[PDB]
Amino acid sequence: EFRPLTLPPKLSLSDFNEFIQDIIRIVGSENVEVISVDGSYMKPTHTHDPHHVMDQDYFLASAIVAPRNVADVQSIVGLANKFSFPLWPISIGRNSGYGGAAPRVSGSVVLDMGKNMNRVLEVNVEGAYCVVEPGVTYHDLHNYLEANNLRDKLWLDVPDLGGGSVLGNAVERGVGYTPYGDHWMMHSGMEVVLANGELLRTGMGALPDPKRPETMGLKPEDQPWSKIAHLFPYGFGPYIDGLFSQSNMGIVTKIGIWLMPNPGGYQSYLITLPKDGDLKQAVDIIRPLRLGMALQNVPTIRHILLDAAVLGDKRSYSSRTEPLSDEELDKIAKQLNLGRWNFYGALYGPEPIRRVLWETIKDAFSAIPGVKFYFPEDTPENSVLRVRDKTMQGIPTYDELKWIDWLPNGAALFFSPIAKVSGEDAMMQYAVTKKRCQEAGLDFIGTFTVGMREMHHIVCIVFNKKDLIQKRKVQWLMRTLIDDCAANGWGEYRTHLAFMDQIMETYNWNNSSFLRFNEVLKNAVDPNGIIAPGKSGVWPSQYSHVTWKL
Amino acid sequence: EFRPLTLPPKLSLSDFNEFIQDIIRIVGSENVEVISVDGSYMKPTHTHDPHHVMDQDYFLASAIVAPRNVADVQSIVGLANKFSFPLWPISIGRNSGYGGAAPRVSGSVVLDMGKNMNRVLEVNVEGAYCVVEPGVTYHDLHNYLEANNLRDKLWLDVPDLGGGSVLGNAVERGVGYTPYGDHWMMHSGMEVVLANGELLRTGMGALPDPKRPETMGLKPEDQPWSKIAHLFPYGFGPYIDGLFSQSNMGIVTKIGIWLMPNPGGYQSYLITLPKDGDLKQAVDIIRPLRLGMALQNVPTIRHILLDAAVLGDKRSYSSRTEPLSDEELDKIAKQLNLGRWNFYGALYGPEPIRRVLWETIKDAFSAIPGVKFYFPEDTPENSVLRVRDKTMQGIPTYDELKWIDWLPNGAALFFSPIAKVSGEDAMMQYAVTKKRCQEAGLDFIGTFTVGMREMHHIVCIVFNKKDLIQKRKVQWLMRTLIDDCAANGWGEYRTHLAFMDQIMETYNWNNSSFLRFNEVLKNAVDPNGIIAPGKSGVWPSQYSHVTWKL
Amino acid sequence: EFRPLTLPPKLSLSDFNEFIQDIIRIVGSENVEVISVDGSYMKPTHTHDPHHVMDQDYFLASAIVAPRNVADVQSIVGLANKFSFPLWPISIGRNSGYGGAAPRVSGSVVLDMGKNMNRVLEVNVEGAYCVVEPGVTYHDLHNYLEANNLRDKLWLDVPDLGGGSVLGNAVERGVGYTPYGDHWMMHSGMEVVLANGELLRTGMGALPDPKRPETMGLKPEDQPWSKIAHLFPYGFGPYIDGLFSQSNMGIVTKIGIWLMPNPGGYQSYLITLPKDGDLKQAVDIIRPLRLGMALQNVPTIRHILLDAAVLGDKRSYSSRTEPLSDEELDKIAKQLNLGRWNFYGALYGPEPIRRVLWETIKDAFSAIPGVKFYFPEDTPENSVLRVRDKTMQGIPTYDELKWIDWLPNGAALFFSPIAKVSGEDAMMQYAVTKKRCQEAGLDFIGTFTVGMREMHHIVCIVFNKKDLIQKRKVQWLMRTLIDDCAANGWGEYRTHLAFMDQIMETYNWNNSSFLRFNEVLKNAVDPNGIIAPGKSGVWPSQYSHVTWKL
Ligand SMILES: Cc1cc2nc3c(=O)[nH]c(=O)nc-3n(C[C@H](O)[C@H](O)[C@H](O)COP(=O)(O)OP(=O)(O)OC[C@H]3O[C@@H](n4cnc5c(N)ncnc54)[C@H](O)[C@@H]3O)c2cc1C
């Protein structure tokens, strides 16, 4: 195709046309689409942000290209370096609340790795790992284990939804809820296409599999990996793996992710905390238990509107347009059999071990008046606990998508700071965020996900995407929250395309030493600045800061 | 001082003299030493390799410089960039078996960070972490916890000896034996002086501590850290921390290391395996247990000569000059009440939990004929179990230094490949290594340290450092082992100065893609190539490969 | 001399020594001083900041050099470009509250232009202007006019003290209180030594004086100026004069400043405003009057503690260590016969004209209850009005120096934002600043100086320079005020050395477009970055931002 809505920087329409003809001959007309529709979670869009906080077409691809295999990504990168065409690689494109599949720089080709590079490459039982391509979603990996009956020996670790990409999510350093919840720390052995187009394998993946007749003459992408590749992630020398997470330093084509053995015993549970103020005592209680491993997985503390929004839109609970009152939150809590805060967790391992920990957990949460303990069986058929019971054993579900429908044309945007695992800090973060949410006219909706020495506080901002006034309030909100949390010593761990610059500007100790160093690294490996310029605030030097920053 | 034995590359005697007068005025004559003695573990040398496999003066400093603080490192870096003088930073300089304090390039200044930058900067109880400077040895951190009575709340994780540096060891990705044994994975928040001399803090350390009257006007090195700096290592954007382990990308001035809470119950144990061939069954047994966490710490599988060498030199068991026979190893085993292989481990937590796991461990090791189970009380006063009982609870000891005295002027050199956690692989690596040791005329001495999905096999080569014939056999051995292990799909995780190029050459998948990328990074950040050139085989472009590689 | 406390960046001791011997042979040993004392207003220091907010030696010269004439500055510039030595030019060095004579970069040579380049070059009566060198203080220019009896034809315009430099103050865009109070707007024709060392004259000064026998053979610095040089500032083409105010783009050697003709009638006056809240009504009143020119000069609105501090230290009014209360300020007001706010002004011209405006002023201020009107005769012998009566007619005094002695070892630091000429805005800025001063534990002390469409609000922070705790609170205060005022839409017009980067960061519309442009200009004209690097936050490219910004 001939004429796109937006062309990448400094590129002419003829270069665009030459380039797109070049890619079409490499991958076929069925794997290329020129943009000359927000869609669904089911068939995500790959052209722009479906949960658009800015105008819909603000972050817009000029074309979508689907490589057939690693060789095609090498050729595409060569082309982009020839024409200076920025690429924006995506795996599944479901980064909802974070920009979706939209590029930071409009005019970029969205590189759709996941359409054709789909394979579950290996599932290794003795080493309890899997190797995967960008296109394997959590649902797909689950089906792979089920079809081969591997569920009895190995379990997966999934986020709240099941359509996301195992590799995609892990390179963003996403989180899950079993004891393998720290996705990025469970990796070992990644394959990357560098900006120069050279293939590179990290860790023990750089120690080549010894030659043998059966693997002679295979292209590098197609070679097997040496025995320790997916078992010990460090290899030898500088450990460069992290340069590839939340970065623009390369295109990840394959990754090994460690899988937990069936634990031989499982029990999910829900602890309802009656009062809004019970967050403080609960976190204080969670601290020592999470450090000493009575709390085995990544347990969450859900605010009552998160659960309420899973079960029904705002219209179903109130006809109010403004934020529900405190008294109304107590009525919704009572209506659903939940507290104002709901703690979700799971015990793993043999009964004798589950028993002891469970009594420790129970006994410690008993200092909170009115606490109530439930197992999935004890709750209604449509409960969040019955969904999270599946979630905390690695089974993918889609039920929790429903909270995005809290409002009319509900879109999501995530404010994601990190808090200490302390009631004092958690209340304070809450207090800060709640106050700005109410100034903005939005219900506070959020969850804390409990890590070992930190909690990821996901404030779920939901707004009407067809309401220009509220979109502007969301943007006012997000920007102020960033600043306020920064003034209180808290940083966000992951964000949307429009907030990357502002969030990187917050990590400016010693006059921005941290981004300068990233900048130095980036321009050495991408001298044409073709790999997703702007991702995380890191700009190659051909992208003036005055022009491009937000 | 005026005239060093060796000058760094391309530097004149006059530039050397100017430089050293420049350093003397910054740090004082007491903190600078010109080299115009192997020493002890007690007072390590900082001029060369005390366990010299090459000639003693092969790797030699021109001078030793001890910065007083971070400002001094900054100024020293500026001078090195002015004169193009290569710096070799050390923390404690006890990297015995790995080159000690010796620089890869002779003529380099050895930067002694540990003499004056010694401080335990902070021990945080609620967050269960500590922040430290290069000079805090494990023994020092231990004493710090004892003086303040923190041992009841927090434990350390130590390597076999206690004199090493907490930071030094951790940036080498060193290993320990409690559940916090993956030293590098326990870090969060590092401070680094870049090659350009700029101070940088990683992760959440880049999110500055909010201003307040009490901290106004403090030099950047002296500023407090924001609340989440030592609690969540990822921060935001590219996770660049790993670029600083086993690298020459920076000079680490401070690091945060997560500390394990007193577990409320501890019991070490020893499981003796009668036969040489029992390794295989044992590892096959260890696999599922380690994966399902019945084995909580990093348990080890010591070969009988390791324990034997701790208890007495070779002269005490035989007057032989050649390797002890198999029949002799069985006699030494019997004499000491140990098997041919000895498995050391520890159970953590409340009694009810220790009980269940201990029965699971017992029962699974029972499939090996003649297995015997000991607690420290059950063994003699000089046993390795009573020493390692301390070691698996983070208490520092120095007893295990005695195996370096197996031979007359015993020096150590470590051959450190990684193996799958499988009887088959472990036997095979053992077979390969044992064969080459006997060809070399040396006793096989070693340990396997059990990681989750891998084992670190430390073959401990001990030789007479005053025996030129054997030193040459050591070098013949090491180099052949590298190749043999590489030809069987195994790579080493850490190595000595003289083997770094050969070991990086082994991680050459796709025509050395991994080292080219490291080179690209290094020359961007060190355009004068003044930070430890050659470390891990990574050479700045001013250091011709033909000239410098070994 | 041989060994300075601090050397400029990247310079060796030997280059320093060579350089200083080179300068000594150009200007003599009497004109050069190596720094191997805070002093007084009378004999200002030229080595560091006498009103030090940071440690005393924080901003420190390596040497002081006093050029004999323009040729000497040219040669000094050549040497600095040869050695890359940063120069910090000063005229008188009395920039008290703004860093004094201290360089932004420590190690810089302080260039003392005023010691030897002292001359009143010309006082032209028909054109009502004067031409001056860096060393002509206002007191000196005053004496020059008196000696020749020119006071009857021409008046000066002075700042609160008389020792400052006419040129120095003017290139800082300093303010005065007659109708000629916008010092920078009264200039026409400047002479500058560029960074490359070339002499340049601006405006009509670029149109050379026609040749004539009497001026043949004169060095360029010594040539007369063409007739219109000091009469029309614009010249032809780009008007580049402003690139030389509050900048590091050149070294100003001579300037022409327009002088007001004796007005043929003068009467100063004081209007006391009883209440703290009367600021608002007063400013609302001042607005139309200032715009329609009933208020002819630059009238000021002094806070009661400013006048109180001129008359006696804090010990004389209270023995309190904390801020005086509101009730105490009313008592001090009553004691001195002043309001809580005191408006000082002056009427110029023939009696008939003074009469009419004076009735217009009186009548409009009459809407404020309790207002009282004084002429100098009506007040006591030690009043501020009798001092400012002199000040509003261009006569230099030193009386107002006494407010710096409010506290024990009182030092001054100025927080200088701009406010709209509106009661609403003025109160609001006052509210913001007063709140932060009380949190800091300091008395609020300040003045508003009334411009045509804006007011310069000088918050005069006075602190004990030997009190480390309060110095830190001063720094905490200053930095928070900057941010607070920025968050309310107000920027500072001038600042001290330690706040320059933070204040330039505030003028960051469109991703700092304004400073990028300044950077581009500066590196073209100073490729060695030797003229006052860092002045106003503008850094030559050899000065890494990470390293140098505060
Ligand atoms: C209701 C809801 C719930 C969510 N719950 C969770 C949760 O529990 N945990 C969680 O972590 N997230 C959660 N998310 C956030 C996000 O939706 C998921 O993390 C999702 O899996 C991320 O998208 P993806 O991995 O499918 O898609 P992708 O669009 O592939 O996103 C990948 C992103 O990482 C980079 N990237 C991806 N692939 C590559 C590659 N091959 N090479 C280089 N860079 C690459 C790019 O920066 C890109 O923007 C949730 C979102 C919603 C809407």
Ligand SMILES: Cc1cc2nc3c(=O)[nH]c(=O)nc-3n(C[C@H](O)[C@H](O)[C@H](O)COP(=O)(O)OP(=O)(O)OC[C@H]3O[C@@H](n4cnc5c(N)ncnc54)[C@H](O)[C@@H]3O)c2cc1C
């Ligand atoms: C008998 C014996 C037993 C051992 N047992 C163990 C064991 O169980 N586990 C284990 O891991 N090791 C073991 N070691 C190996 C090694 O001796 C220890 O890891 C020791 O702690 C490493 O030295 P160090 O950390 O004190 O000293 P250092 O000499 O400080 O070594 C640090 C090294 O890392 C780098 N480095 C250090 N500090 C910095 C800095 N500030 N900035 C930049 N780079 C830096 C340099 O490359 C340097 O060579 C053993 C050694 C012997 C002789």
Ligand SMILES: Cc1cc2nc3c(=O)[nH]c(=O)nc-3n(C[C@H](O)[C@H](O)[C@H](O)COP(=O)(O)OP(=O)(O)OC[C@H]3O[C@@H](n4cnc5c(N)ncnc54)[C@H](O)[C@@H]3O)c2cc1C
């Ligand atoms: C009690 C008190 C009251 C004050 N009242 C006033 C007031 O009413 N109005 C006011 O404006 N200020 C006031 N000031 C602020 C300041 O003290 C005066 O402006 C003073 O005249 C400025 O110093 P200077 O001009 O003598 O000295 P200098 O130290 O000469 O300062 C000149 C500055 O401008 C630059 N500069 C000077 N000469 C040159 C040159 N030749 N070439 C290039 N750059 C040059 C440099 O950046 C330098 O730092 C006051 C200060 C105090 C302590």
